Amino acid sequence: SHRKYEAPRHGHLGFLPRKRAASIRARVKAFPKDDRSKPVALTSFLGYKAGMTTIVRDLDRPGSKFHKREVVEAVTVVDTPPVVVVGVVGYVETPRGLRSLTTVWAEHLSDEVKRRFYKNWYKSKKKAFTKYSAKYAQDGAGIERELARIKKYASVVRVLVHTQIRKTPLAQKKAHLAEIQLNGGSISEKVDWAREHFEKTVAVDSVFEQNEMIDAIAVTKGHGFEGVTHRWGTKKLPRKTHRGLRKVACIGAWHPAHVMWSVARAGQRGYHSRTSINHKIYRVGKGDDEANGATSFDRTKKTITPMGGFVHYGEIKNDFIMVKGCIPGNRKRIVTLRKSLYTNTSRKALEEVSLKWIDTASKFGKGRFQTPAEKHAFMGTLKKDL
Amino acid sequence: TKFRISLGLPVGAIMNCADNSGARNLYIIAVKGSGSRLNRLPAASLGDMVMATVKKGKPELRKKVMPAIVVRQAKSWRRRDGVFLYFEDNAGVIANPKGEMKGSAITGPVGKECADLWPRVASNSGVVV
Amino acid sequence: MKVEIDSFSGAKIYPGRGTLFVRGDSKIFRFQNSKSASLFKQRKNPRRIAWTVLFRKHHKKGI
RNA sequence: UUCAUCUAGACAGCCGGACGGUGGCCAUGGAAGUCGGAAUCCGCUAAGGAGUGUGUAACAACUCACCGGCCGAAUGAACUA
RNA sequence: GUGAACAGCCUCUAGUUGAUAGAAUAAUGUAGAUAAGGGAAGUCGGCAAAAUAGAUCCGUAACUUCGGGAUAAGGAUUGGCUCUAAGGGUCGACGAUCAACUU
RNA sequence: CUCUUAAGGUAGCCAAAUGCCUCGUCAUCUAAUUAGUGACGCGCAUGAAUGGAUUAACGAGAUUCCCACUGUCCCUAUCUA
RNA sequence: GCAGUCAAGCGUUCAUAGCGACAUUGCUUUUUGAUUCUUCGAUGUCGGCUCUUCCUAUCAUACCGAAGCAGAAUUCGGUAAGCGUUGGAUUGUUCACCCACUAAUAGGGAACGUGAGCUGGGUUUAGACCGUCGUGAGACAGGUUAGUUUUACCCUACUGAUGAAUGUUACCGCAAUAGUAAUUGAACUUAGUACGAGAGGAACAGUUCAUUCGGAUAAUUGGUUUUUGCGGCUGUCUGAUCAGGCAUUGCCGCGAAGCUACCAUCCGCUGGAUUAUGGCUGAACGCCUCUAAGUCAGAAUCCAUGCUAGAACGCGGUGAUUUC
RNA sequence: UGUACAACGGGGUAUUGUAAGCAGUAGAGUAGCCUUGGUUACGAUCUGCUGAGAUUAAGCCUUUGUUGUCUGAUUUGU
Ligand SMILES: [K+]
Ligand SMILES: [K+]
Ligand SMILES: [K+]
Ligand SMILES: [Mg+2]
Ligand SMILES: [Mg+2]
Ligand SMILES: [Mg+2]
Ligand SMILES: [Mg+2]
Ligand SMILES: [Mg+2]
Ligand SMILES: [Mg+2]
Ligand SMILES: [Mg+2]
Ligand SMILES: [Mg+2]
Ligand SMILES: [Mg+2]
Ligand SMILES: [Mg+2]
Ligand SMILES: [Mg+2]
Ligand SMILES: [Mg+2]
Ligand SMILES: [Mg+2]
Ligand SMILES: [Mg+2]
Ligand SMILES: [Mg+2]
Ligand SMILES: [Mg+2]
Ligand SMILES: [Mg+2]
Ligand SMILES: [Mg+2]
Ligand SMILES: [Mg+2]
Ligand SMILES: [Mg+2]
Ligand SMILES: [Mg+2]
Ligand SMILES: [Mg+2]
Ligand SMILES: [Mg+2]
Ligand SMILES: [Mg+2]
Ligand SMILES: [Mg+2]
Ligand SMILES: [Mg+2]
Ligand SMILES: [Mg+2]
Ligand SMILES: [Mg+2]
Ligand SMILES: [Mg+2]
Ligand SMILES: [Mg+2]
Ligand SMILES: [Mg+2]
Ligand SMILES: [Mg+2]
Ligand SMILES: [Mg+2]
Ligand SMILES: [Mg+2]
Ligand SMILES: [Mg+2]
Ligand SMILES: [Mg+2]
Ligand SMILES: [Mg+2]
Ligand SMILES: [Mg+2]
Ligand SMILES: [Mg+2]
Ligand SMILES: [Mg+2]
C-alpha cells in the first residue's frame, strides 16, 4: 500500500556513494570555459583552510530592509602563499575524451615538491628528476621539442603547480601538486607562459580579485562510520523501540526482494569531495602587509590572525583569500579555489563589499579583546607583567 | 517582508496577551504562511500572524479562533546586524485578518520586526525592541 | 561598528558577541558571554563578583 | 458498390444579382424570411426559400440557397472493407 | 559519625581485593545523564522521564459513616558563627556543688 | 377499549463494565471530541440478596479534564561506563 | 471504481462551453463477491509509526488549448508523475468527521509493502463482569477489564571498508558507465493600471524575502562537560592546618576544546533538443490547410553543462628504477 | 644531522574567580587581667599583598632555552 503520508526523501541521491574521497586533495572536475581573447591566467589556486572569523560591512542591496546598514557576516580564511610552477601538461582531444600527450617539467624542483613523489623521503636517495634535469644540458633541445609538440597539439594546456607548504604553519612539509588549466588562448603562448613561469611563483592576487565569486573544492571533514540518523537525517524511532531507535524502520518492501540503493544505510560520513560554488571574496590580503586585518574604518594595525593564533592552524604569514560564509573541509586541509564557471549577475554577485571591521579576538574562547594593546588598555597593569 | 526569525512558538504554545482587549493569554493553533513537513509542528516567530484562542480572559473572547500577532518571542533569534536577542516572555496581540488590532494599547516592549511588519501594532506600541 | 558594554561585567561587546535581553520593563541588558548572562540570570551582584568592572570600581582596583 | 453533375461548360475558386405581391395568416408587449403554430403560393424571371445563417426590442444591415461573369475537363455524394 | 532511624553515605575491628585480560573509543546497543524556545502538539493511553519531597511555622475545601478527608490544597523558613533565655539532680527562701540534651 | 398472563418489571437506575440502531438526542467540556461528564428514555435485551439505588474512606483496578512538570514530540544534539 | 459511443433533452434561444436520459461498448483489480489452484510436519494473522520506490485515472506547481474566458475567480481538456501533497480534537481503528494552515492538503501499488524494524490500542488462548439465550455445562461480528511479541554470527541484497594479480614503485590525469536536485509561496513595483457601468481587479520585466528539500560549516549564539579545568557545598576519613580520599562522574555555578542545531551560518549552475500547443511555406483537393515533403517557437519534460563515484580484468602522461 | 623531530621549560591565548602564607585601629561578640584605654583566649567572616592562584592540548598558537633521538626488519626487475 501507499506511504499513507507524503514526505520528501532523506538525503541527496546525486552525492552517492557516501564513500571516502580517493584523495585528500579534491579534484577539479571542470575548469572555466576558455575565453581565448583574454590574457593567459590561472583558473584556480591552491590554499589551506586556516579557520573562520567574522566581519562587519555595510550592505549595499537596494530594496532590502538592511540596505546601507551594518551586517555581521561569517567568513573563512584560506592561507594562500604563491604557488610554484614546475611543469606544463598538454591535453589532446580524442573520440575517447581528453588525453595527456606529454608533460614538460622545470629543470629544478624544490624539496617541497620532490617530497610528493616519495613515501619514505628521509631514507631515499632523492633521485627524482635527476636524469630529467639533464634534458636542460646545453640548449634544452629535448625540452623545446616537447614544448613544440604541446604547441603543435594539445588543444588544452594545464600547468603543474605546487604549494609552498613550508610557508604555512603546517607540520606536513610535503607540498601539494595540482594541474591548473591555462585560460587565455593561443596555445602557443599558453605554453610560452608556462615555460617562462617555470620555477617561478604565482601570487593569489594575480588569479583572484576582490568581490569575485569563486568555488571551493575540498574534501569535507571526516566523521568515520555513522548511523542513518545523522548520516541521512532520518526520523528517530520512538523511545519504545526494541533493538535500537537510531535506525530506519523499513529498509524495503517485500518486493523487490532486495535492499535498494535509495534506502538510507549506516556507513561513512564526511571525507567526501565537494565543489561548493558562489563564495564571494571579501579580501585578497597580502602576507607582507602589516595591518592585514585592518580596514579603512578600523585602522588598527593588526593582522588577520586572531589573538593566540588560528585554533589548530597557527598564524597567517602569507597572502590569504577571505571568502564569505563557509567552505567544505576543515582547518589545515588543502582546498582548491577556482574561478566561477559562469557569469553571475544576480546583484548578489557584482556587489562591491567594503569591510568595516575584522574580528581578531581569540577563537580559543570567549575572546574579549582584538589586540594585546587593547587588552592592556582595558586591564591595566598585571602582577606578572604589563 | 521580514527576515527569518528563529521559531520559538510551535502549535500549543501559550503566550501572554500584551494588548488591552481583555484576553490574558493566546493559545497557538496555527501559523499563517507556514509550510508543510511530516510531523513538523507549525511554529511562530516574532512578527508572525497566528490563529489563536483565548484560554483565559474575558468570556466573549474565549472559545473562538481569532488572528493574533506575535510581538515578543523570548526565544533567541539572530538579527542581520549579528545581535542575538530575546525578550523576557512570549507575547502576542489580537488582530483581524487584515492586521488591525482588536485592542488599543500594548503593554511592554515590541519587537522591531513585528512593528515594521504591522503598522497598526507599531502605531499602538510603546517601546520598540 | 559600535562597541557595546556588558551590563553585568562591563566588558566591551563587539558585533555578534554575546546576547541581548529585553526585560519586561523594556530595559536592555547586553552580555558579552554566557558567563555574565548566567550570573545575571542567577541575580548575582556585579558589585560582589570580584572580576567585574563595577566591583573593581567599588573597590578602587586599578586606580 | 451505387447514384449523380459535365464542353448546351461540371467541382472548387474569385466577382455580380439575390427581387416584387409581402410587414403572406396568426398569439405576442414587440415578431417585418430568420422565438414560434400551421400555410410552402403567385409574379417577374437567367434567378432568388413566404427564407441558409449572423444581426435588431422591432426594423435595418450583412449572408446563403438559386442564377449569372471568369476558367476550362473532369467532378461530387452516400456507402463497402 | 551524619542522620528520627538496623535508611542512604564515610570510617574502626574482621574479611576480601575473587570475577579472562591488553589496545583503541566507529555505528547500533545496555545502563546512567544533560539540553535553548515551546510544553503532551507524541502516543491507544503522559508509557518513560521530569517535577514534589526532610523538618519548623502558617493555612487547609467539597464531602463525610463525624472516626476522616489531611501531608488536602496553598505558602514562608532552613547554612555558618557569636550570644541570650527557659526547661534539672544532690547536699544544708537561699547558698554550695554537679550534670545532659531539647526548644 | 380490546386481546391476553402465574404475574405482566413495582421502588429505583440507564446509550451505564448492560442500548442493536448508535459516533442516539440535548447541554457542557475543546479551535476541533466515535472520548469524559450532566441530562432524556416505547430500555434490541436495566431493575431489586440471580440483590436495586447510593455511598465517607480505601485501590500498583478502568476512565475524562485541569495545574505543575518534563526530549513523549517539534528535532534532534552531546557526554560517561 | 473509472472511461467511451449515440443523442431525446438541460443549458433563457443552442445537443455536444459545461452537462446529458433511453440504450450500448469497454477498461481496472486500490471494493466486495465467486472459486478452492498454492500453503494446515506453520508464508506471524488489524491498525499506526518509520522508510524507499513505483503507477497515473493530476490535487498543486510548468507550458498550453476551450468556455455560458470582460477582469478577478472558476470550469472542461492536453503534454506532463520532474516536484510537493501537512499540523491537530475523537476513534485501536482502515474508513469517517470536524478544527486549521497551505500551492495542494490527488488517488493508489509494491505478499491488501513494511512485527528476527518497532508498538500491541484492537482482533483472536487461558482470568473476570454485564445483557440476552440455554434446565445445565455453556453460546454470542454483543459490550467491558487484564493478558511473555523469541533468534542473525550464515548466504545474498544494500551500506560503507580492504585487497592478490598487470615488470616494481611514485605522482599527475582522462572518463566509459552509474547516480543526480532543487522546490514552492509572499511582499514591493508594474498598478488601483489593463479590463470593467460599477463593484472589483490582473499579467510580463525588475527587486526583497520566505517555504520545503539538499550539501556543507562552527566565526557568532545556544546545547552538550571526564578539561573532572576553576570555584563553591554536604557527610565521613587522613590528630588540626595545608592538601586530599571516598560518596559507582557526590552535588551545584561557570566552563575552554571537540561535536553539534532552520536553535547557528553559508551555498545550491546554464545550453541544447523536445511534448502539448501556437505558427511559416505548401500541395494533396486550381481554393483552403501547422503536414503530407520541408520548417519556426515552445513545458517543472529529456539530454547535455555542472556535481558525486571512478571500470578494483578501461586508458594516458610523467619521475625513479637496486654498483654489493 | 636539520629554517629536523621529540620531551620539558618559557611566552601568548583561554577557563575560573582572588591561591597558600602573613598581617590587620576590620569583625556580631563572649569570657579573664589592669598601666580601666589597653591587653589575653575563641570567633563565621572581612580587608591588603591578589584580576591573584590553579589549569591550559591531551586534536590551541609560538619558541635565540634545557635535555635527548635519528641505518631496526621484510619485500619488490621490464
Ligand atoms: K496452513
Ligand atoms: K562549546
Ligand atoms: K571532603
Ligand atoms: Mg502518496
Ligand atoms: Mg519493547
Ligand atoms: Mg572557539
Ligand atoms: Mg506524525
Ligand atoms: Mg428575429
Ligand atoms: Mg543525633
Ligand atoms: Mg528543553
Ligand atoms: Mg529551558
Ligand atoms: Mg507550562
Ligand atoms: Mg494527542
Ligand atoms: Mg497524533
Ligand atoms: Mg485518542
Ligand atoms: Mg510513570
Ligand atoms: Mg502541603
Ligand atoms: Mg481529595
Ligand atoms: Mg419503570
Ligand atoms: Mg438505556
Ligand atoms: Mg451518561
Ligand atoms: Mg482528549
Ligand atoms: Mg440481571
Ligand atoms: Mg490491598
Ligand atoms: Mg516460519
Ligand atoms: Mg517470512
Ligand atoms: Mg494522463
Ligand atoms: Mg500486509
Ligand atoms: Mg519483515
Ligand atoms: Mg515480531
Ligand atoms: Mg503489522
Ligand atoms: Mg491488547
Ligand atoms: Mg479471554
Ligand atoms: Mg436463565
Ligand atoms: Mg466469536
Ligand atoms: Mg546538517
Ligand atoms: Mg557555549
Ligand atoms: Mg559534571
Ligand atoms: Mg576507604
Ligand atoms: Mg572526589
Ligand atoms: Mg499560410
Ligand atoms: Mg512533417
Ligand atoms: Mg581504476
Distance of A273 CA from G58 C1′ (whole Å): 39
**Do A47 and A216 meet the contact criterion of CB atoms below 8 Å apart?**
no
CATH topology of domain A16-81+203-220+270-384: Elongation Factor Tu (Ef-tu); domain 3 (2.40.30)
Q: How many CB pairs under 8 A join A and B?
A: 24
CATH of A82-202, one of 3.40.50.10420, 1.10.3720.10, 3.90.550.10, 3.30.1430.10: 3.30.1430.10
CA distances from A236 to A54, A93, A264, A281 (A): 34, 51, 13, 39
**Residue C23 in contact with partner chain B when CB distance is under 8 A:** yes
Give the C-alpha separation, A348 to A346, whole Å. 5
Chain B, window 13-42: residues with a beta carbon less than 8 angstroms from a chain A beta carbon: 37-39
CA A184 from centroid of its chain's CA atoms = 23
Contact A46, A353 (CB under 8 A): no
Query: What is the A228 CA–ligand 28 centroid distance (Å)?
Result: 25
At position A321, the amino acid (one-letter code) is: I
- Which whole-number Å values give the CA distances from A354 to A93, A298, B60, C20, in the listed order? 43, 12, 57, 27
- CA-closest candidate to residue B115, choices B105, B107, B123, B104: B123
What structural domains and CATH numbers belong to chain B? 8-129 (2.40.150.20)
Name, in order, each residue with C-beta under 8 angstroms of C7's C-beta and a sequence gap of 6 or more: C28, C29, C30, C31, C36, C40
Position A84: which residue type?
V
List chains touching B (3+ CB pairs under 8 A): A, C
- Which residues have CB under 8 Å from B12's CB, separation 6+? B27, B28, B41
The CA A238 to ligand 16 mean position distance, Å, reads 17
Sequence spans of domains, chain A:
16-81+203-220+270-384, 82-202
For residues B112 and B49, what is the distance between their CA atoms, to the nearest angstrom? 15
Experimental method: cryo-EM
Closest CA to A304 of A243, A261, A361: A361
Distance of CA A200 from the midpoint of ligand 16 (Å): 74
Q: State the Cα–Cα distance between residues A160 and A105, nearest whole angstrom.
A: 8
- Put residue A365 in one of left, alpha, beta given phi > 0 → left and psi -120 to 50 → alpha: left
* Strand E proximal to A240 Cβ, under 7 A: yes
CA dist list (Å): A255 to A2, A189, A258, A308: 14, 61, 7, 60
CB A78 within 8 A of CB A49: yes
Q: How far is B11 from chain A (nearest CA, A)?
A: 20
Resolution (A): 2.0
**Nearest partner of B42 among B18, B70, B62, B19, judged by Cα:** B70
Q: Which three cell numbers stand for residue A341?
A: 564557471
Domain A82-202 in the same topology as domain A16-81+203-220+270-384: no
Virtual torsion, Cα A57, A78, A331, B79, nearest 10 deg? 10
Rounded Cα distance, A178 and A344, in Å: 27
Distance of CA C40 to the CA centre of its chain: 8
Where would I find the H helices in chain C? 34-41, 53-58
Chain B: nearest CA to C35, how far in angstroms?
15
Q: Which of C20, C23, C24 has the CB atom closest to B84's CB atom?
A: C20
CA distance C23 to chain A (A): 24
CB atoms within 10 A of CB A18: 18
| Short-list B33, B65, B26, CA closest to B48 | B33
Instruction: Give the SS3 label for residue A277.
Output: strand
At A158, list the grid cell: 594545464
